[PDB]
Design a protein around this ligand. Structure first.
Ligand SMILES: COC(=O)[C@]1(CO)CCN(c2ncnc3[nH]c4cc(F)ccc4c23)C1
Length: 167
């Protein structure tokens, strides 16, 4: 038993809700919140800009030190950093950005990072400003993640569509 509430169950291990991940994170304090990161951990907009704003820019400060030490992430890769006031940990995962021409097949590799964590609160990778089809992203999520994932979908219209079209 865990503290996530109001989710619809899609599969044995995947759950979905219409929610603001920042507010969902603020109430649940999950062990892991996933950020829709880029390779530079520049949290300017989308989910990343919202999560970072909710941390009063502490996420960005921590991220800049991470990059200065380690260099950029790989597309499809991830790193674990602090969850600040939102979660114990933040798993920064880089899905491919279609608006940069990145290979959508890397989306499966991106979701594989979730399997290193037993339970996660997450957005749909490569959705939103990353330019992928959220329905495809949901399919890859279901077919790749084996751990327990609670997907927060900000847009109510999109949430309803994802549910109605789910196979
Ligand atoms: C149509 O696709 C989308 O909604 C996205 C657009 O890039 C992709 C994923 N995403 C989010 N997903 C779950 N919670 C979210 N809270 C947010 C707060 C913000 F200020 C901005 C975005 C989100 C957000 C936004």
């Amino acid at each position: 038993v865990n503290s996530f509430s109001g989710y619809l169950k899609l599969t044995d291990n995947v759950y979905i809700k219409n929610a603001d991940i920042v507010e969902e994170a603020k109430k649940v304090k999950p062990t892991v919140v996933v950020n829709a990161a880029n390779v530079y951990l520049k949290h300017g907009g989308g989910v990343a800009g919202a999560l970072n704003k909710a941390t009063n820019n502490a996420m960005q400060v921590e991220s800049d030190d991470y990059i200065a030490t380690n260099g950029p992430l790989k597309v499809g890769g991830s790193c674990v950093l602090s969850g600040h006031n939102l979660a114990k940990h933040c798993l920064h995962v880089v899905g491919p950005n279609v608006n940069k021409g990145e290979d959508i097949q890397l989306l499966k590799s991106a979701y594989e990072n979730f399997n290193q964590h037993e339970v996660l609160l997450a957005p749909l990778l490569s959705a939103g400003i990353f330019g992928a089809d959220p329905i495809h992203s949901l399919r890859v999520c279901v077919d790749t993640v084996r751990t327990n994932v609670y997907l927060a979908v900000f847009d109510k219209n999109l949430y309803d569509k994802l549910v109605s079209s789910f196979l």
